[PDB]
Structure 1
Amino acid sequence: GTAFFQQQQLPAAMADTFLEHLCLLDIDSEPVAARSTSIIATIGPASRSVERLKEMIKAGMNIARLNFSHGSHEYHAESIANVREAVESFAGSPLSYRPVAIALDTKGPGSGPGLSEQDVRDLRFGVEHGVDIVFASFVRKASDVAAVRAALGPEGHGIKIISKIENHEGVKRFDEILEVSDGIMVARGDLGIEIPAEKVFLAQKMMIGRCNLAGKPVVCATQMLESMITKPRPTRAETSDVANAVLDGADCIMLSGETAKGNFPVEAVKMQHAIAREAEAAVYHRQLFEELRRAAPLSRDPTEVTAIGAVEAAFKCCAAAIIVLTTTGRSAQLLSRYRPRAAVIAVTRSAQAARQVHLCRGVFPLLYREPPEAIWADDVDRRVQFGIESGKLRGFLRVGDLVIVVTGWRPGSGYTNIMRVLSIS
């Protein structure tokens, strides 16, 4: 229908130049796709209540950030427990259950050279409490990441390390830091004090571009909706900042004082959700997919090869979703790096992977709880149907939609190799 092609900035998406794309942007073209940029909310006194955390999960919070610069281990353990209680209160309905990752943000090495002794103790606390992600403060070189990795020990091998770039050295040694990190955070607060304030946007845009090229998650952080700490509505500069972080290519956007200590934590999450949805429809996919495709090197890894085939197939038919089965989240991450317009519905049995895939733009995790079927192909089919039924319930899919289904040839991680075109019945 013509109405379908007027929504989600589709006239602007068909443009032959970026300039014509901008000219075709329409404030009356409503977003239809699910919001794909994850929201990280910092936990604090304004957002620790189990009832308030349920409201924040409903508003769109995907990752709960524990800022280890404030509070003791006992404070952070109560934070984790309240987060988990609010998250599990929705587990009774598996088709709508929303996993929420827990991220530990370290205090950092102040005047110190390597990992501080408080960071070693906090990192071990994170492993003991099962945190999914570490936002490592003031990462200046590859050896800082290795030290964080070593402090996590053998039991924390699965924890994702997102390096926070907060100073000139981190920006200059960015390539070597990205190579050993799982992702990056553009920590604009310290960065804006360490380098001239008028240069932070160059560092943000460069880091987001390089992370998009590398296919690794990038978070835009600090003062995105600052005035909402005290005011019910943000400034014109703040909504523009959130929209531009999404247009830049950020996988995640963050709220600090806005959720940790402010008077409007739920509204700040709702505002980021509303802006991100509008900005995602305004992305010029024609140029973006072409440039990601051109820049990505050749690969002999079947997961990487299946991912680009599936993203190309999704664009060809305007697929509502790409449903992928994943154990570690890697197959969903490889789909996400090509920035499909189609939602990537990731079905997994790993509760940790379901939480961690929120780092990748456009990945919607579904935690599958059923015990395995005796026939492996039936187990695969049951999981795919769970993705379809959840997708229908949540509004991602309707009967008649085309979906791309990504699976593997045998059980266990690392064997994704199949792409299949499916009609929703």
Structure 2
Amino acid sequence: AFFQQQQLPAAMADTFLEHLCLLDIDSEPVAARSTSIIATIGPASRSVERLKEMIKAGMNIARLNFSHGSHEYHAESIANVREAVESFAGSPLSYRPVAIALDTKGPGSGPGLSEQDVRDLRFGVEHGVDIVFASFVRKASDVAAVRAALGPEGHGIKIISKIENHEGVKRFDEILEVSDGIMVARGDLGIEIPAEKVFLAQKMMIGRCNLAGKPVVCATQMLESMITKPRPTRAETSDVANAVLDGADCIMLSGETAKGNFPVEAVKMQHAIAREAEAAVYHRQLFEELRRAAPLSRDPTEVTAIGAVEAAFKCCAAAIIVLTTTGRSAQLLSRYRPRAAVIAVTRSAQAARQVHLCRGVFPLLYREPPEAIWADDVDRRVQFGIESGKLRGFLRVGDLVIVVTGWRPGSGYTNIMRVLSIS
């Protein structure tokens, strides 16, 4: 029965063509949904009660569109998101962190950092936002200007550059090099370049981000008809599935959740599609290609990450449990696209929110009392990942897990991979 679920007959195929031939509508997804859902907050999704339903439906990142609304409006949206999120903190083994992302208005008619963006970026730092979706990035100096406007207090906010025009596509490599990730902003991109070429830019950018090991977001009109209708079109469900199959780390909802009549249903639909598409991923070729393309490295976190992903595939590990301070060790595991869930146990509330940008990373915020012996404290965090995993359905007694830790406290010392039997 195990080998009939999660498209495992299609996963064992020797060619991609045979993999397609073996895809089965009756093979149910079992693994937890890996691709994060970004939902835009607006009039249709601002209330605390609505936000609680959206968190339960699968929203991982709340997007604030600073093209509309005042700072007072956005501060209220932030407070409502935090209130809805913290209402589930009473059960620490099932609490779900939710990131807050600020989407800038943009440079507009000018080719420089606007005065409104400088004010909005400062608002973001003061309100503790986790991510900035920087609009209309056309070159590396645009990313540097956003970074500078965040100042010294905003040093830890992730900058996701939105590629929205021909220049951004042509200067992609230099933009990606200085960004934390990319958003394929298809709305403006489809007006700036011929509509029939947007899919080439999406596929190229997803491929280059996967190669770089940096998050990529697919955005705009994914479930557009759901703004007024309860069910999406056949093109819309295929678009969501294909963004996941292309290699996108995150999928986004704009008007569907910000102003539409069915915000919760749009989140549920993206969750349902992503789960089905993730099981249909051809890991046999994907992992070998990512493994071949990632350069040789002498960084122990990089070396441990490939060893752990290889070990997970060998035993069909239910999960890879990793301890992380900044999220980096979890991101390096994520870049190889394991079928095994990457359960990231962290003390940092910000890192727990930010790792939603990386596909297959399930953040757990550790809030248990400390152990006096560091080695005992490490083991306790590892057991916490196992208990949360058991409660959430990721793990069962008898499962094998890969555990990734470091040799000394502090960030940057991951170097150990262990094979653990559950209970």
Q: TM-score, normalised by structure 2?
A: 1.00
C-alpha deviation, 1:301, in angstroms: 0.3
Q: Matches of 1:176 and 1:372 in 2, distance apart? A: 43
Q: Matches of 1:417 and 1:126 in 2, distance apart? A: 35
C-alpha deviation, 1:371, in angstroms: 3.7
SS in 1 for 2:112: coil
Q: Matches of 2:148 and 2:370 in 1, distance apart? A: 34
- Deviation string, structure 1 residues 174-205 (Cα, Å, up to 9, x no partner): 00000000000000000000000000000000
- Deviation string, structure 1 residues 186-225 (Cα, Å, up to 9, x no partner): 0000000000000000000000000000000000000000
Q: Matches of 2:13 and 2:361 in 1, distance apart? A: 26
Q: Matches of 1:120 and 1:372 in 2, distance apart? A: 40
Q: Matches of 1:260 and 1:213 in 2, distance apart? A: 32
Q: Matches of 2:386 and 2:371 in 1, distance apart? A: 18
Off by >2 Å, runs of 4+ in structure 1: none
Q: Matches of 1:82 and 1:414 in 2, distance apart? A: 35
Residue matched to 1:196? 194
Provide the alpha-carbon RMSD of the alignment.
Answer: 0.4
C-alpha deviation, 1:6, in angstroms: 0.5
C-alpha deviation, 1:230, in angstroms: 0.3
1:118 aligned to which of 116, 119, 124:
116
How do 1:409-424 residues align onto structure 2 when only pairs under 5 Å count?
409-424=407-422
Q: Matches of 1:115 and 1:292 in 2, distance apart? A: 36
SS in 2 for 1:392: helix
- Deviation string, structure 1 residues 296-320 (Cα, Å, up to 9, x no partner): 1000000000000000000000000
C-alpha deviation, 1:373, in angstroms: 1.5
- Deviation string, structure 1 residues 155-175 (Cα, Å, up to 9, x no partner): 001000000000000000000
Which residues of structure 1 form unaligned runs of 5+?
none
C-alpha deviation, 1:294, in angstroms: 0.5
Does structure 1 residue 146 correspond to structure 2 residue 140? no
Which residues of structure 2 form unaligned runs of 5+?
none
Does structure 1 residue 164 correspond to structure 2 residue 162? yes
C-alpha deviation, 1:107, in angstroms: 0.2
C-alpha deviation, 1:113, in angstroms: 1.1
Q: Matches of 1:159 and 1:300 in 2, distance apart? A: 27
- Deviation string, structure 1 residues 53-75 (Cα, Å, up to 9, x no partner): 00000000000000000000000
- Deviation string, structure 1 residues 93-123 (Cα, Å, up to 9, x no partner): 0000000000000000001111100000000
- Deviation string, structure 1 residues 6-37 (Cα, Å, up to 9, x no partner): 00000000001000000000000000000000
- Deviation string, structure 1 residues 270-296 (Cα, Å, up to 9, x no partner): 000000000000000000000001101
SS in 2 for 1:45: coil
Q: Matches of 1:296 and 1:406 in 2, distance apart? A: 20
C-alpha deviation, 1:48, in angstroms: 0.5
- Deviation string, structure 1 residues 306-355 (Cα, Å, up to 9, x no partner): 00000000000000000000000000000000000000000000000000
- Deviation string, structure 1 residues 205-252 (Cα, Å, up to 9, x no partner): 000000000000000000000000000000000000000000000000
1:211 aligned to which of 209, 212, 225:
209
SS in 2 for 1:63: strand
Q: TM-score, normalised by structure 1?
A: 0.99
2:42 aligned to which of 28, 32, 44:
44
C-alpha deviation, 1:370, in angstroms: 2.2
Q: Matches of 1:25 and 1:93 in 2, distance apart? A: 38
Q: Matches of 2:26 and 2:271 in 1, distance apart? A: 18
Aligned length: 423
Q: Matches of 1:28 and 1:93 in 2, distance apart? A: 34
C-alpha deviation, 1:385, in angstroms: 0.7
